[PDB]
């Protein structure tokens, strides 16, 4: 939890870059930077590591966790809009 | 086949790749 | 080890560990050169026993450095690269005792290697004495048995196939079946002997019959096959146990 993550969609090869000046968009390798796309995951909608060696300690499962995306650069949380 | 003898001989193939024959014909009549 | 009253220290014991590691590696490289041809020349034996004595001598020094329980010697040598050298020696030991113990001419070098085996386990056992219960050094030696379990299984089976030999020999269930008992037991007689003692997988009966003597008709001695052989497998195997 809390370490940053970039996201690449696989079937295209683009990066989910948060251009909140317009919208959460999908841009390429050369255009994507750190603050444009880097996300973390937390247990909840709250806001209250990075330097280890080895393969680390397994924090998060696959099936049994509900993670929430908190962007580094803007603090934004992913949401939906209300076949 | 003695193993490394092949690979040294291949290194010998790798250098002067039979363009020696230009030297073969060019010398013999000067 | 620590050399206080002078100016700059030279920890000589790690240096002699490193020389042992060198000789270990070169014995291991001599193994691979005879890993396939399996009938060793006079020059190979003459050179090889000449190396065996040197390895015997450096293990006697590694005993009598650490044989007194001066614990700092144990600690300082515990974190060096001894364990890998020991692992490499065991990997020599298993396959070497296997393919050596199959001829009549290889008796002498096998004597020498069992001797080296004895002083090597003398060194390792004499190292492991300042234990408590779950000591660090005991954990290290557990771990080197873990990482090279395979070949040590071969050496334990090699001890079995000449300890149980004297056991199944010493009973008069076939040693009485020859009327003479004067070292005359035929190869088919010894085959129907050793299979019907019923402690032997038949591959290892083939191993012993391939090993034994092939003594000029089909026979084999009692005294000068197993009582010949049963002494060193007792002596080293004692220390192993």
């Amino acid at each position: 939890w809390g370490q940053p993550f970039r996201l690449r969609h696989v079937t295209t090869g683009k990066y989910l870059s948060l251009m909140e000046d317009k919208s959460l968009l999908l841009m390429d390798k050369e255009k994507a930077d750190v603050k444009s796309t880097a996300f973390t995951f937390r247990s909840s909608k709250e806001k209250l590591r990075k330097e280890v060696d080895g393969m680390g300690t397994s924090e998060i499962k696959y099936g049994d966790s509900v993670c929430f995306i908190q962007h580094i650069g803007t603090g934004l949380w992913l949401t939906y809009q209300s076949s | 086949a003695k193993g490394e003898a092949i690979r040294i001989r291949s290194i010998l193939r790798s250098l002067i790749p039979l363009g020696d024959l230009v030297g073969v014909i060019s010398i013999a009549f000067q | 080890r620590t050399q206080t009253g002078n100016n700059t220290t030279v920890n000589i014991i790690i240096s002699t560990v490193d020389y042992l590691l060198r000789v270990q590696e070169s014995i291991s490289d001599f193994y691979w050169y005879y890993s396939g041809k399996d009938v060793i020349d006079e020059q190979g034996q003459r050179n090889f026993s000449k190396a065996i004595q040197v390895a015997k001598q450096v293990f006697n020094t590694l005993t009598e450095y650490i044989q007194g329980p001066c614990t700092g010697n144990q600690q300082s040598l515990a974190h060096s690269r001894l364990w890998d050298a020991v692992v490499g020696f065991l990997h020599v030991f298993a396959h070497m005792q296997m393919k050596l113990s199959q001829d009549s001419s290889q008796i002498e070098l096998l004597k020498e290697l069992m001797d080296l085996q004895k002083d090597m386990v003398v060194m390792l056992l004499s190292m492991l004495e300042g234990n408590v219960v779950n000591g660090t050094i005991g954990k290290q030696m557990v771990d080197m048995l873990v990482e090279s379990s395979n070949n040590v299984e071969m050496i334990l089976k090699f001890f079995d196939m000449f300890l149980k030999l004297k056991d199944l020999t010493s009973s008069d269930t076939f040693k009485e079946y020859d009327p003479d008992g004067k070292g005359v037991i035929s190869k088919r007689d010894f085959h129907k002997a050793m299979e019907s003692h019923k402690h032997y997988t038949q591959s290892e009966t083939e191993f012993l019959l391939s090993c034994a003597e092939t003594d000029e008709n089909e026979t084999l001695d009692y005294e000068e096959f197993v009582k010949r052989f049963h002494e060193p497998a007792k002596d080293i195997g004692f220390n192993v146990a």
């Binding site: 750190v34 393969m55 397994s58 998060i60 696959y62 | 690979r7 250098l15 | 490289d29 050169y33």
Partner: protein, 192 residues
């Protein structure tokens, strides 16, 4: 700490052309493209590097005479003077030394069959201090020499090829439990 068998590492350099720390690493695709190629890692915040097609997995380390023993036809730790394999961690192809060129600098390709001396590489120390027989720590600079072609893993100008001129190569670790999120992975992002 050390580089144990059957983990996941890379190979890497720095390209210096007029004050460049152009940190290129090694990548190869396979898949209708046998020749290996480059991947810069200096431009990290600039470009997130496509790192899935760069990594490799050690299958097997042995000694040189043990390589002869295999050529008669268990997570050990490698030492300077071992012969190793390098499978491409993605494609499953093994990294080898091709007998073609693009002088006499041989090309570097991927292949399938582990037979023959193409797939195999010795290691040599890039240190007067650290030398033969001892371990390879994390991040040790090292030279790789093929068994068959007996050429160094050369970085040319920018080609990557087997040549008679040495080239430094650094190694960095990448990875080494079940049901647990482990990085570098492709997955689905459910909603409910």
């Amino acid at each position: 700490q050390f580089l144990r068998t059957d983990d996941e590492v890379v190979l890497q350099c720095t390209a210096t052309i007029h004050k460049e720390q152009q940190k290129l690493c090694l990548a190869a695709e396979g898949f209708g493209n046998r020749l290996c190629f480059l991947e810069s890692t200096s431009n990290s915040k600039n470009v997130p590097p496509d790192l899935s097609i760069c990594t490799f997995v050690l299958e097997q380390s042995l000694s040189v005479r043990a390589l002869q023993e295999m050529l008669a036809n268990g997570h050990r730790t490698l030492l300077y003077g071992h012969a190793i394999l390098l499978r491409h961690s993605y494609s499953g192809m093994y990294l080898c030394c091709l007998s073609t060129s693009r002088k006499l600098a041989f090309d570097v390709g991927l292949q399938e069959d582990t037979t023959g001396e193409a797939c195999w590489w010795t290691i040599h120390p890039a240190s007067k201090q650290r030398s033969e027989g001892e371990k390879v720590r994390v991040g040790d600079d090292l030279i790789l020499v093929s068994v068959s072609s007996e050429r160094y893993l050369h970085l040319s100008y920018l080609h990557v090829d087997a040549a008679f001129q040495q080239t430094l190569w650094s190694v960095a670790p990448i990875s080494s439990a079940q049901g647990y999120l482990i990085g570098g992975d492709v997955l689905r992002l459910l909603h409910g």
